[PDB]
Design a protein around this ligand. Structure first.
Ligand SMILES: Nc1ncnc2[nH]cnc12
Ligand SMILES: Nc1ncnc2[nH]cnc12
Lengths: 286, 286, 283
């Protein structure tokens, strides 16, 4: 029934979340995934892990085969996808070492395959217009947040708490990402424009991954690791992965493993059926 | 002599604006148009209709061959293009069931062929930089608005009328569209950003259609149908019936607009359309 | 030593010869003119080719930058025509840019990736201040040396703005083209606080940094885009008429800037340019 896929970003190229049971070199109608998929169990919950950028981190954000990654996880029976992403902060209260359970995004990517459906031969037949107002699976979002609570990691909810309750390092219970195409980081001019728009963090990999997960009928939630402030305060590759970030990986692993258990502890029949019905009801050719 | 092409969007996949005299199954130097073009008359005015998404609505917005559609209409001697588009509202006074005769846009599309000219072997030779300050044919916009008046539909001009003149359903006498690439709808984050920029509606099909019409020397005007509020604002059977009624009204507007176009001389406007292309050829002026 | 490449846009020394080169990323826009400014080697490359037949979205920026790198250039000075989005930047002015916002798409914007037509690797370049500051200041000093007014918004104000002037800083929005902006887009860009709009700065500036080169751009204001009156709305004739009046000033600045670069030592700067590339490899 429930099976949890995990897409590991920067810092999660060889996650070792569970003892490896099987290794799947698979293909999809949309090509090869970033790497082999590793299947196993967390407790009694089947789980599948794949590194977004492949082994050795050779695939840049704009060239990841998001379609193949999501479709391959779905083909293996995944009902959920938990994903990590390293990001820069655009706001004073989002400090390096914090995490963010995202609930919103603004898309500035281009040139990436962002839908399974279309009119050309390398796509599924149909025109699919998915609602994306709240683009994540809210139930799965709350499980990431509860998992943090269960692992004694501070949770800061701006809606029900004051700024004095923002004790770092903390998990931010909501937040918006602007997803840029990369590979370059933002200019200071771009960073201030994103901040003035009210965006919380900037990354390169959330879109179209989040969109395709919903197209596939899967429940998707992302946990973003704040690795540095973006250049409005500067961001470098070495800074995006440092001693704080090495500590961040430890706690993100604990959140992910606890989130998988928490997913497995609940019935998802109605949510899964709703995910599938949202796809069929978004077809405008039918 | 004038000849009006009509590109029908959602709700116009198979319109019967007139008894079809002939059909033209053609291709263009830029590929196949979305469907067979249907030829006929409104009164004594020659007319040509093609559905933007093809019959059966199998072609999504980013895959529509805008170049082929415009070129095919130009090849048949069209002097004008009237186009429809179903859109979401970004503003409180643009209510489902209203219409907008667009006069402005912000472009957020990518990955679409948006010009007939370039340095590639299959493009027309030359560098064409068209002015787009006011990107529609203003004379044809005013015909659409007058057609609405002639068909007893309210017209609301916010530049001269108090918001107490905004009586629904109404044709908004001006408005701006943000054209997103699709196929997904916007997030709430994106919707509120577009709203804060002052954009009136969101759609997926205006650009590059409007640009290519001007490149082709054709007078282009768009009438948008507001089908719903975009997701900045938090049953379906009522919305569907409302859209059906909107299609009936837009069909009335198109039929009257064709007659009004035929009732005037367009020699000078057509010549100015063609001169604007020649004066935008940077390679010739250099 | 130093060697300065010049990438000249719309309508834009002792000439020794013309050279055709190939690159791993294709052919440059045109042949390159090799020569000297005093004792400094200099190479001139027309961005849009002879006859201006290549539109901004189709310029092979990777080839142009790599061609100059392969010839041993340490610096690239670039020009571009642009539209002003702000009252105090008027046609005939110049802007030594220091910032940009990118609205381009569909252009090859990096030398590195996982496809066979790119260099193997994942390169995430910092771009907070995307130009070479030393080279920007040389463009400004060159204008001073040629008796062209310099206007600095951080220390002067509109009352002290003498045209035609070189604006000592400024941000560009780079749009993909080939069409000019709508009024709606122009006002949105202006409300974001951008100074000018153009079509060719990106990915040229990004690829220069990827190649370890010092890059600075001087933009020529040819028009007010289309946020003003209808008689002031941009079109090709308007851009070309003003560009022809401003070329000789751009010439004087660029040629003076080449001499000023050659008068200084760039050893540590060049080292830092190269080291920045190496430290940005994530693979
Ligand atoms: N500042 C930043 N911008 C974009 N992606 C990032 N990933 C980590 N830090 C980032
Ligand atoms: N207004 C403008 N927009 C874009 N590119 C330009 N080049 C010159 N003027 C321009």
């Amino acid at each position: 029934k429930v099976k949890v896929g995990i897409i590991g970003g920067t810092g999660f190229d060889d996650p070792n979340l569970f003892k490896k049971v099987g290794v799947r070199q698979v293909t999809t109608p949309f090509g090869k995934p970033s790497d082999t998929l590793v299947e196993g169990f967390v407790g009694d919950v089947a789980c599948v892990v794949l590194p977004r950028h492949g082994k050795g981190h050779l695939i840049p954000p704009s060239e990841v085969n998001y379609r193949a990654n999501v479709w391959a996880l779905k083909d293996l029976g995944c009902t959920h996808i938990l994903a990590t992403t390293a990001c820069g902060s655009l706001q004073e209260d989002l400090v390096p070492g914090d995490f963010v359970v995202l609930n919103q995004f603004m898309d500035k990517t281009w040139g990436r395959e962002n839908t399974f459906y279309g009119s050309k031969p390398d796509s599924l037949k149909g025109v699919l217009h998915m609602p994306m107002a709240e683009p994540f699976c809210e139930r799965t979002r709350q499980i990431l947040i509860q998992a943090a609570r269960n692992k004694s990691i501070n949770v800061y909810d701006k809606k029900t708490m004051d700024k004095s309750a923002c004790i770092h390092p903390c998990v931010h219970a909501e937040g918006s990402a602007v997803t840029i195409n990369g590979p370059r980081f933002s200019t200071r001019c771009e960073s201030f424009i994103h901040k003035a728009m009210g965006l919380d963090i900037v990354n390169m990999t959330l879109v179209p991954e989040v969109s395709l997960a919903r197209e596939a009928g899967l429940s998707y939630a992302s946990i973003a690791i704040v690795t540095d402030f973006d250049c409005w305060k500067e961001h470098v590759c070495v800074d995006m992965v440092l001693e704080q970030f090495r500590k961040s990986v430890v706690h993100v692993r604990e959140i992910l493993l606890e989130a998988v258990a928490l997913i497995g502890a609940e019935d998802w029949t109605k949510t899964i059926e709703a995910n599938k019905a949202l796809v069929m009801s978004s077809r405008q050719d039918l």
